[PDB]
């Protein structure tokens, strides 16, 4: 039975990667039920704990709520070959979710050393995507591009057009936007949007909409980007995803840059309310930043405090964007001293981003 439950554990893993929550849950309950009627097998129990952890990650992605660290400590309190691979990989997934990007990469890199134990090429594609994903969040464009391309080529080769393939297209476009290749990014995003619609998953369709708005916003087309942020915000909010917070934030921000201060205030109130319900202290900090900058008195101490929180949280890419926006805002208002102050900090952040390579 110890050899057959391992088969079930692997089948469970397959269902998890395919985002089959209902089937995975039924198999989870069955395996956990059968393990209670078996002798104490150590490696087998660690196998289960790792997979239960991976299972909870999948569940929270599909159905987020406003015990992870507890089951993480139990895992870390305890491996070789396949289980060691799962150990670093799954913990890397968790650290990315917790916005600990450097630690997530470190985990992924250790997992990558044991990638020989992965026989499923599609399974490898998921790994390559997750690596590409985390690299994008720290603006390591060409590491991210390479991993994302490898992953995308595998999905295309097997003609597996699921969530992961669309996500790959999101990352590739995101990287292109970071190097100001907006035309190429849009081509990828328009393909990704249609692929998202084919999946009939509201989350991916909303994310596609947000990414289009994100690209157009970087391009300078604020009018078009407004509509895309609005649509993304509405969809995310309908299905109660935490992504609604970021969507409304970008919507609030673009209202500010358009000078539509009435709509900006309305979006701001909506955003801080949502961020508070999700206990998202970091977006509360971001909302406070742009409110002070555009809708407030632009107090330098308040702004500096907000940027201090962002940098200490190691959200360097986000801080870079907001610093550039802050400096530009003071410059056009001809507040040159304040502008120079934020241009300098923008310089410091770009250096920190580069040093992390």
């Amino acid at each position: 039975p110890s050899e057959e439950v391992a088969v079930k554990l692997n089948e469970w893993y397959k269902l998890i990667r395919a985002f089959e929550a209902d089937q995975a849950e039924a198999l989870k309950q069955e395996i956990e039920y059968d393990l209670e009627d078996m002798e104490e097998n150590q490696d087998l129990l660690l196998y289960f704990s790792l997979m239960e952890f991976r299972h909870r990650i999948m569940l929270d992605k599909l159905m987020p709520v406003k015990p992870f660290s507890d089951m993480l400590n139990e895992i870390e309190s305890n491996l070789t070959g396949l289980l060691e691979y799962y150990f670093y990989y799954f913990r890397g997934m968790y650290e990315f979710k917790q916005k600990n990007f450097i630690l997530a990469i470190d985990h992924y890199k250790h997992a990558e050393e044991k990638l020989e134990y992965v026989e499923d090429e599609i399974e490898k594609a998921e790994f390559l995507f997750k690596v590409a994903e985390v690299y994008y969040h720290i603006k390591q464009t060409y590491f991210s591009m390479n991993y994302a391309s490898q992953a995308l080529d595998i999905y295309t080769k097997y003609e597996l057009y699921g969530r992961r393939r669309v996500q790959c297209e999101f990352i590739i476009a995101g990287n292109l936007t970071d190097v100001y290749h907006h035309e190429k990014a849009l081509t990828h995003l328009c393909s990704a949007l249609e692929h998202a619609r084919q999946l009939e998953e509201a989350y991916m369709i909303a994310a596609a909409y947000y990414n289009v708005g994100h690209c157009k916003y970087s391009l300078g087309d604020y009018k078009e980007a407004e509509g895309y942020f609005k649509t993304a915000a509405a969809i995310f909010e309908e299905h109660n995803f935490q992504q609604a917070v970021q969507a409304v934030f970008s919507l609030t921000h673009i209202y500010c840059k358009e000078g539509k201060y009435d709509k900006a205030v309305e979006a701001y109130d909506r955003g801080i309310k949502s961020a508070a319900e999700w206990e998202d202290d970091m977006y509360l900090t971001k909302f406070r930043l742009i409110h002070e900058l555009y809708l407030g008195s632009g107090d330098l101490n308040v702004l500096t405090e907000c940027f201090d929180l962002l940098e200490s949280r190691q959200l360097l890419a986000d801080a870079e964007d907001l610093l550039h926006d802050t400096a530009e805002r003071f410059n056009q208002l001809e507040h040159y001293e304040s502008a120079a102050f934020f241009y300098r900090r923008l310089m410091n952040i770009k250096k920190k981003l580069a040093e992390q390579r």
Binding site: F170, Y210, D318, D321
Partner: peptide, 5 residues
């Protein structure tokens, strides 16, 4: 901000 996945 970063793009979504």
């Amino acid at each position: 901000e970063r793009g979504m996945t």
